[PDB]
């Protein structure tokens, strides 16, 4: 940067919906955080009826 | 013909312009001497473009 | 949108800036505060000669 | 004293031209007013202006939420996570806008 | 006399202490904490005040 910029952080308004395989949930569940930024959990049953 | 009006004669040197005669010309007649310079400038511009 | 072409607008904007400094009223202001100072120019002259 | 008068003169021109600006848009109001500010800046020290610097930038694109703006990025990356900030070099002057 | 060399730099957040400065930092980094010292680059030039 020869000054930079002096960028106020962008206001989140969004819902975040985070897709992915359970195994991939298993390293990113650890975090307090996470459950509560995260409490929606849609999972998807592997099989039909 | 409004430096004529005061007994003042107009010398056109080119882009710039300037007024012989008895004493210093009025005000106003210098700030249409520079209207008139500034006026030709942008005349010019418009011209071009 | 509409505030991009509104800045769009101000931002040319800049030759009516332009051609409000070419006005004749803002040109007799400027022509007659020069005046006052080169007035107090030659005043020091005088009291010097 | 010319600087104040140019000065004195954008001020008095830019508001009939910026009020109905706050009119149609009052929570612009800051920036209009900052960018009459750099008009304001450009008649009074005679210094020039960058559009660049002055235009406002536009991320998203208006939706009436039907459909909602959906966006997924399968490359989860800060330049495209959260965007990025780029700069210019001009025969090694660096410059930003 | 450099005016950005010479000139006080304010830190403390004014208060009458009723509420008293309550500060918060849910994200903790010594440049956050201690504040830092930022420096200008003028075409590869290093300048601080």
Do not use: C
Not at chain 2, 22 to 38: C, D, F, I, K, N
Not at chain 3, 7 to 31: A, W, Y
């Amino acid at each position: 940067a020869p000054a930079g910029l002096e960028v106020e952080p962008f206001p989140i308004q969004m819902q975040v919906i985070l897709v992915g395989t359970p195994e991939a949930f298993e390293g990113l569940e650890e975090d307090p955080a996470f459950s509560e930024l995260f409490r929606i959990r849609a999972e998807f049953s592997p099989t039909l009826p | 013909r409004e430096a004529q009006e005061a007994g003042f004669a107009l010398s056109t040197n080119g882009e710039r312009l300037e007024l012989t005669g008895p004493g210093p010309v009025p005000a106003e007649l210098s700030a249409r001497l520079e209207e008139v310079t500034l006026g030709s400038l942008a005349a010019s511009a418009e011209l071009e473009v | 949108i509409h505030l991009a072409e509104a800045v769009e607008g101000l931002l040319l904007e800049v030759n009516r800036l332009d051609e409000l400094f070419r006005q004749g009223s803002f040109l007799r202001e400027k022509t007659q505060l020069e005046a006052r100072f080169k007035e107090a120019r030659e005043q020091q002259l005088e009291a010097l000669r | 004293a010319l600087r104040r008068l140019r000065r004195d003169w954008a001020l008095h021109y830019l508001n009939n031209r910026f009020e109905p600006l706050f009119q149609r848009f009052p929570q612009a109001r800051a920036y209009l007013e900052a960018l009459r500010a750099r008009l304001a800046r450009y008649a009074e020290t005679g210094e020039p202006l960058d559009p660049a610097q002055w235009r406002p930038n536009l991320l998203t694109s208006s939706s009436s939420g039907t459909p909602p703006p959906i966006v997924y990025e399968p490359y989860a990356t800060a330049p495209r996570l959260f965007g990025r900030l780029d700069y210019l070099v001009d025969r090694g002057v660096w410059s930003t806008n």
